[PDB]
Amino acid sequence: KRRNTIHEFKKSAKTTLIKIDPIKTKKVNTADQCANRCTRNKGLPFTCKAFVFDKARKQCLWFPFNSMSSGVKKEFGHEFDLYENKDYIRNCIIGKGRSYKGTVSITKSGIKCQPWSSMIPHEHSFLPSSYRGKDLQENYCRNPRGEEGGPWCFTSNPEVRYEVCDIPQCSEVECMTCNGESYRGLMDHTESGKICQRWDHQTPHRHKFLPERYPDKGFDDNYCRNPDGQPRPWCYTLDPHTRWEYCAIKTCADTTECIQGQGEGYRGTVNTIWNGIPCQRWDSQYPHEHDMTPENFENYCRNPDGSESPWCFTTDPNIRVGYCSQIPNCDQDCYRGNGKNYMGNLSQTRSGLTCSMWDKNMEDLHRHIFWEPKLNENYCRNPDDDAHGPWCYTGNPLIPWDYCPISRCVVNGIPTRTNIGWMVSLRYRNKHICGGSLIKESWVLTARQCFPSRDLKDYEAWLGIHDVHGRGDEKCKQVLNVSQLVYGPEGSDLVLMKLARPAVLDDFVSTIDLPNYGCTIPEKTSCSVYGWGYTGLINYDGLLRVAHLYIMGNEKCSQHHRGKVTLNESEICAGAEKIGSGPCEGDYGGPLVCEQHKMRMVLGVIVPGRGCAIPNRPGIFVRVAYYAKWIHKIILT
Amino acid sequence: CKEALAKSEMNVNMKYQLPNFTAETPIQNVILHEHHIFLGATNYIYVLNEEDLQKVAEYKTGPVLEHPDCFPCQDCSSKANLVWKDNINMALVVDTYYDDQLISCGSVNRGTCQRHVFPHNHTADIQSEVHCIFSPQIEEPSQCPDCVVSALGAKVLSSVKDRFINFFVGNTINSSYFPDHPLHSISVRRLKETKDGFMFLTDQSYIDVLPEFRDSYPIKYVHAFESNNFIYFLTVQRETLDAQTFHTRIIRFCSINSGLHSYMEMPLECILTEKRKEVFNILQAAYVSKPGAQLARQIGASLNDDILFGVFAQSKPDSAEPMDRSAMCAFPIKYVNDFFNKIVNKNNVRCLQHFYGPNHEHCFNRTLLRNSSGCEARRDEYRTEFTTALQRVDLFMGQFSEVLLTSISTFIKGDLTIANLGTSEGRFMQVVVSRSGPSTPHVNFLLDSHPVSPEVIVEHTLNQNGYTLVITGKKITKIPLNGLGCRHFQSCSQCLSAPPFVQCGWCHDKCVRSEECLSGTWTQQICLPAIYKVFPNSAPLEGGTRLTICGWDFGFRRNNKFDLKKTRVLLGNESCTLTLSESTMNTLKCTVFNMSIIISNGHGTTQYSTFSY
């Protein structure tokens, strides 16, 4: 016939055994039929103590030795999987002790069980030749006939022919807890001496558990488990006719209100459901008998099954399960913009970093800031009444201070005649992505909508070019590496880039001043913008292109928007002279700069929104004055 | 007798002329915008009057000619030869953030879409503007960005983030059609200002399964939405790369223009459980909505916290088809949020199968900062696949356990939540949902032979003027959410059990609205016993043979229950015998010169004068 015995094999994952001092592979689809061949009598002349298969190989290689055999090197090879003969690993007695292989030749009276090849002194030694496949060891006692009594070894003693070996029944160590699901041992026999099938297998029962799908429960080769929370662990039967069976195990040796988790480990005195109906006790099967018994693990609403809510049988006969769902489970500002107005018991920044210690923080504050002469340490409340809300100092040497998160209440391109050093050509993937404006010898600004990747070792700054790629002026261009990005306050969407090295100034390269922090604009005031971005023209030579705009109030802006937006002070609105011309793709982060009387400074930044350069429609820009002091307080870095 | 009195039930069939509109072709999607119903359909697109249900206008993406030489939008009219295929509108969305636009999509044109703009003077004409979202990729012809619409599966989610239009699209794809056009499972197509193409912000902006599995492991997408910056998805796929079963999953991730950073999938199962088990693999339709006040307590939220509703049907063995057995399931977003974040241990959480492949560097020795990380964008994202599911008790307890449910919508009224179930075959019901008890369908009638589409539109202006739009086959219907009528009710019990927002009251003869009682006998409060028959009609003062009493409204009405203790039965002066085990609100049993027989039920009484000595 053709039978299965891999179920009697063990397995291990992603290891291959290399016996340095020695065993053949034949391409066979089924590692399981492979193990069955290894077991099946006379299959190979050598002593197939285990097997290994690699489904990448699909080559079937029996190994006539254990890993406990000396000198064999395991190797973490994913494709290779071992399958051990659990009999050599039993080291105990199952039933008759019929199939033993363990290396023990000690009698019950502590005598060495003779070499079974030794005719001396006792006659019946010829067995290993006679009984081949029983692993009739050199000296170690085996159960030659599958005798009830077990391995009985012909003692070397002159007086006694054989003394029976004694090996414990395996369950001596296979104990259990009342839950039993925690226990994950070797005992792979049912309560009727039946054997559990391999949990990876789908035959003869294709049950629900896929050990990889439900790992962490020890659904290893055949080992009894409690997956469904029975008082006893149980397994699906190797026999197709038995659906499944319990596993015989002995026992082992040696509450509050607020809810944790789904209440499973949690325990409760309360057993009134949201309907108010009290629930009855575990003994009291009434009104309708319940399976759960104290043997499984008062009249309380516990979670023995670990349901979403602990559940107790309504004394109402109609309802089987009632949910005591009133149970409690253990589980920001408005119009106050200055930090002192709120006491923030919060230790985090907006970056997610924790706070720092308010002592050195306080000292550095007083040193840097003498604005005025309270709060707790390491907490969201901030003294300096900062407009962008509550903040906290940070332990980072790169960044010392960050806000803590509490909510409170160019189309028609006209090219530039000459060069502007304020512009910065951001090259990611080695080409311009957005405009940036230089303020310090070591600081540029642009918008947060301009940045795919979070690193720096991709990005690049290009400096002092009138054409897109330094195509004309290879004499004066210069490229810099990126040291840091800084993300602005909430809803700011303003990112400040420091380069790896400040770029020493020159005629061509120009930094820009900041607007007056509290300043207000005059309406229609002409200003200018510069970009290499999309303009709609047939052929962009790569030149910088300049356009002029004129300030305007909220009115006409929302009017052309027809109420698309209700403005905010963050926003600055400026518009064209009834013509279709405005920033578009590739211009983002471009500057709009203006002068008080002659000295010109940035006032807005190109930000993408709501369509490109629709004629007679105003654009919305950032209020640089709305952030200038924050930019300074960070320029402290 | 019980079947003889089957007239007790409200009739399943009651035909009504509804606001109805017929389609030449099967309907694929629907959009509501400015009192106008835009609906894509087989090779076509239509507009409807919101009140008039009248085709204001329409346009044809009609019989589609395909040429292998042809690009989606390059002209191929002059061509003399070829496939003669048919675009089905798989993706459809109106956008307002830039302009008043409709983004429509063809299935066949390499899955490449178009746009149609609306004038202000008249705001319904679409034949004006046709524009192809077809950005030529001179840079990297590796990836066709505007090739968006998959043929096999399209779930589209449009939003405005960081002042840009973003499309999160989930796509079912076969491995075979990959070389013909390379596409992605889940991709984030961001729409350029110039509105002439989409741009992939990076390489990690797109996710799709390893080229090996793309024959097996079919993952098809069924729903998505936005809430709390987590753009969840509902979709079915294999339990495992080997399982060949299917379990419906919910996916969560954060929305940064770049791409899906913290990508999480969790299994979701709905179980109908009893004392001392049926699990629905396959979600059929869903709807995320606010809860009714009674539901807010019963499941644990406010009137504003968002609850996701999933109508799940049990799957055929090793197959994603349903076993015609469905229920519905509620999921507070708070609970799923916390399950993703904190509840799960550190041993469970796995790496994605279909993306990483089991044999990898990262899956071997990589972990999470679960309690120390939520929505954090780290440049090395970890695709996490929780092994422990979230499972819900059916709120219905199988009040439809014998049937499949094609679709669902949700709405609430006052304190209650009422679900507008669509039946597998197309028997639209409206049913109050509560943990209390089963609610009968105050409407149940059969709409049409064909399945009800999961495409369903809900609206309640002022919570007074309200309606849903429902698709089936080639017709859409505007069903007011305000009920239809009380007359079909055929018991005082059934009449009273109706919701208040339908005005139900027995007019001494049948349930009715108050004003229609000419006799003014309109009552909603006392349920008089009604006799159908008596078996037999001849009895002695001592001789006793079984006494079968057919009728209705016999039991005392408690809010749900109908109690037979609260009843007395008299034979004139002599009280007739009550066999409560054999006596129910439908039928009664007794054991004992013309005489009448008086029932005294929970509310009223009656006499029956067909009896003698």
Rg (Cα) of chain A, in Å, rounded? Answer: 40
Phi first, then psi, for residue A9 (nearest 5°) are -80, 155
Rounded to the nearest angstrom, the minimum Cα separation between A99 and chain B is: 35
Measured on CA atoms in the order A121, A124, A128, A130, is the torsion positive or negative?
positive
Single-letter code of the amino acid located at A33 = Q
Which residues lie below 8 Å from residue A259, measured CB to CB, with a gap of 6+? A266, A327, A328, A329, A330
Name residue A259's beta-bridge partners: A329
Six token digits for residue A615: 């004629």
Element (H, E) at B333: helix B333-338
CB spacing of B343 vs A291 below 8 angstroms: no
Which residues lie below 8 Å from residue B343, measured CB to CB, with a gap of 6+? A261, A262
Spatial distance between the Cα atoms of A584 and A49, rounded to a whole number of angstroms = 74
Question: CB count, 10 Å around CB of A554?
Answer: 14
CB A263 within 8 A of CB A309: yes
Cis ω before A227 (30° cut-off from 0): no
Q: How many CA atoms lie within 13 A of B86 on its CB side?
A: 9
Closest CB to A608: pick one of B164, B258, B343.
Answer: B164
Name residue B571's beta-bridge partners: B574
Cis ω before B68 (30° cut-off from 0): no
User: What is the longest distance spanned by two Cα atoms in chain A?
Assistant: 124
Six token digits for residue B318: 């090793």
Rounded to the nearest angstrom, the minimum Cα separation between A328 and chain B is: 11
Rounded to the nearest angstrom, the minimum Cα separation between A291 and chain B is: 6
Rounded to the nearest angstrom, the minimum Cα separation between A317 and chain B is: 12
CB B38 within 8 A of CB B47: yes
By DSSP bridging, strand B186-191 and strand B198-199 are: antiparallel
Q: Which residue of A has its CA nearest to B359?
A: A78
For tokens 């408690």, the residue is B558
In B42-126, at which residue ranges do the beta strands (DSSP E only) sit?
A: 44-49, 55-60, 64-65, 84-85, 92-95, 101-105, 113-117
| B162–A contact, CB cutoff 8 A | yes
By DSSP bridging, strand A80-84 and strand A152-153 are: unpaired
Phi first, then psi, for residue A630 (nearest 5°) are -60, -40
A334 three-class SS = coil
| B338–A contact, CB cutoff 8 A | yes
Name residue A62's beta-bridge partners: A51
B198 burial via Cβ count (<10 Å: 0-12, 13-18, 19+): buried
DSSP state of B342: I
Measured on CA atoms in the order B71, B77, B79, B81, is the torsion positive or negative?
positive
Measured on CA atoms in the order A293, A295, A301, A306, is the torsion positive or negative?
negative
Planar angle of CA A391, A394, A397, nearest 5 degrees: 145
Rounded to the nearest angstrom, the minimum Cα separation between B382 and chain A is: 16
Spatial distance between the Cα atoms of A8 and B475, rounded to a whole number of angstroms = 62
Phi first, then psi, for residue B327 (nearest 5°) are -150, 180
Spatial distance between the Cα atoms of B304 and B289, rounded to a whole number of angstroms = 9
| B293–A contact, CB cutoff 8 A | no
Spatial distance between the Cα atoms of A606 and A615, rounded to a whole number of angstroms = 17
Spatial distance between the Cα atoms of A445 and A439, rounded to a whole number of angstroms = 8
CB spacing of A452 vs B202 below 8 angstroms: yes
CB A165 within 8 A of CB A113: yes
For tokens 């015989």, the residue is A248
Six token digits for residue B155: 């779930």
Six token digits for residue B146: 């505007």
A75 three-class SS = strand
| B343–A contact, CB cutoff 8 A | yes
For tokens 């509840």, the residue is B343
CB B249 within 8 A of CB B265: yes
Q: How many CA atoms lie within 13 A of A356 on its CB side?
A: 21
CB B552 within 8 A of CB B1: no
Give alpha helix (H) positions in A497-599: 554-560
Single-letter code of the amino acid located at B494 = Q
Closest CB to A213: pick one of B239, B300, B347.
Answer: B239
- What is the 3 state secondary structure string of A303-317? CCCCCCCCEECECCC
For tokens 């019929």, the residue is A98
Spatial distance between the Cα atoms of B49 and B55, rounded to a whole number of angstroms = 6
Interface of A with B (CB under 8 A): 78, 210, 212-216, 261-262, 274, 288-291, 308, 313, 320-321, 325, 331, 352, 448-449, 452-455, 493, 534, 584-585, 607-612
CB spacing of B99 vs A611 below 8 angstroms: yes
Rounded to the nearest angstrom, the minimum Cα separation between A116 and chain B is: 48
Spatial distance between the Cα atoms of A172 and A157, rounded to a whole number of angstroms = 30
Name residue A547's beta-bridge partners: A529
CB B349 within 8 A of CB B314: no
User: What is the longest distance spanned by two Cα atoms in chain B?
Assistant: 105
Rounded to the nearest angstrom, the minimum Cα separation between B275 and chain A is: 6
Gaps (C–N > 2.5 Å) in chain B: which residues precede them?
Answer: 82, 276, 592
DSSP state of A513: P
Which residues lie below 8 Å from residue B519, measured CB to CB, with a gap of 6+? B507, B508
Which residues lie below 8 Å from residue B511, measured CB to CB, with a gap of 6+? B486, B487, B489, B490, B491, B492, B494, B495, B498, B504, B505
Torsion angle, CA of B61/B63/B66/B70, rounded to 10 degrees? -40
Question: CB count, 10 Å around CB of A548?
Answer: 14
Element (H, E) at A446: strand A443-447
| B34–A contact, CB cutoff 8 A | no
B492 three-class SS = helix
Tell which residue, A475, A485, A465, has the closest CA to residue A532: A465
Spatial distance between the Cα atoms of A281 and A269, rounded to a whole number of angstroms = 12
CB B586 within 8 A of CB B595: no
Phi first, then psi, for residue A350 (nearest 5°) are -70, -30
Tell which residue, A303, A308, A297, has the closest CA to residue A268: A303
Element (H, E) at B468: strand B465-472
Six token digits for residue A454: 């979070």
Spatial distance between the Cα atoms of B176 and B456, rounded to a whole number of angstroms = 33
CB A92 within 8 A of CB A168: yes
Question: CB count, 10 Å around CB of B606?
Answer: 17
Torsion angle, CA of B566/B571/B576/B580, rounded to 10 degrees? -40
A580 burial via Cβ count (<10 Å: 0-12, 13-18, 19+): middle
SS3 helix, strand, coil % of chain B, rounded to 5? 10, 35, 55
List CB contacts (< 8 A) between B202 and chain A: 452-453
Closest CB to B240: pick one of A78, A210, A610.
Answer: A210
Tell which residue, B135, B116, B133, has the closest CA to residue B124: B116
Closest CB to B379: pick one of A288, A455, A493.
Answer: A455
Which residues lie below 8 Å from residue A3, measured CB to CB, with a gap of 6+? A36, A40
CA distances from B600 to A421, A624, B505, B604 (A): 99, 83, 21, 6
Spatial distance between the Cα atoms of B313 and B401, rounded to a whole number of angstroms = 9
Closest CB to A585: pick one of B98, B193, B379.
Answer: B193
CB B243 within 8 A of CB A210: yes
In B97-253, at which residue ranges do the beta strands (DSSP E only) sit?
A: 101-105, 113-117, 131-132, 153-161, 164-172, 186-191, 198-199, 206-207, 220-224, 233-237, 247-252
For tokens 């307080």, the residue is A633
Planar angle of CA A35, A38, A42, nearest 5 degrees: 155
Six token digits for residue B134: 């077809």
Tell which residue, A128, A90, A94, has the closest CA to residue A9: A90
CB A610 within 8 A of CB A564: yes
List CB contacts (< 8 A) between B378 and chain A: 454
- DSSP string computed for A374-388: ---TTSS--TT--TT
By DSSP bridging, strand A443-447 and strand A494-499 are: antiparallel
Tell which residue, A189, A301, A317, A184, has the closest CA to residue A248: A189
Measured on CA atoms in the order A598, A602, A604, A606, is the torsion positive or negative?
positive
Tell which residue, B141, B151, B130, has the closest CA to residue B61: B130
B589 three-class SS = strand
CB A537 within 8 A of CB A551: no
Spatial distance between the Cα atoms of B112 and B120, rounded to a whole number of angstroms = 27
CA distances from A121 to A142, A150, B150, B153 (A): 18, 21, 84, 81
Q: How many CA atoms lie within 13 A of A298 on its CB side?
A: 10
Q: Which residue of B has its CA nearest to A306?
A: B391
CB A388 within 8 A of CB A591: no
Question: CB count, 10 Å around CB of B541?
Answer: 10
Spatial distance between the Cα atoms of A6 and A33, rounded to a whole number of angstroms = 7
B203 burial via Cβ count (<10 Å: 0-12, 13-18, 19+): exposed
Architecture of domain B6-461: 7 Propeller (2.130)
Measured on CA atoms in the order A292, A296, A302, A307, is the torsion positive or negative?
negative
Phi first, then psi, for residue A416 (nearest 5°) are -70, 135
List CB contacts (< 8 A) between A321 and chain B: 273, 275
For tokens 């690193």, the residue is A455
Spatial distance between the Cα atoms of B338 and B346, rounded to a whole number of angstroms = 15
CA A300, chain centre distance (Å): 37
CA distances from B23 to A363, B470, B480 (A): 75, 13, 21
Spatial distance between the Cα atoms of B213 and B240, rounded to a whole number of angstroms = 11
Six token digits for residue B291: 């809860």
SS3 helix, strand, coil % of chain A, rounded to 5? 10, 20, 70
What was the structure determination method?
cryo-EM
Which residues lie below 8 Å from residue B382, measured CB to CB, with a gap of 6+? B262, B263, B351, B362, B366, B368
| B359–A contact, CB cutoff 8 A | yes
CA B411, chain centre distance (Å): 11
Tell which residue, B158, B449, B413, B435, has the closest CA to residue B300: B435
Phi-psi region of A616 (alpha: psi -120 to 50; beta: other; left: phi over 0): left
Cis ω before A287 (30° cut-off from 0): yes
DSSP state of A43: S
By DSSP bridging, strand B384-385 and strand B605-608 are: unpaired
Phi first, then psi, for residue B492 (nearest 5°) are -50, -40
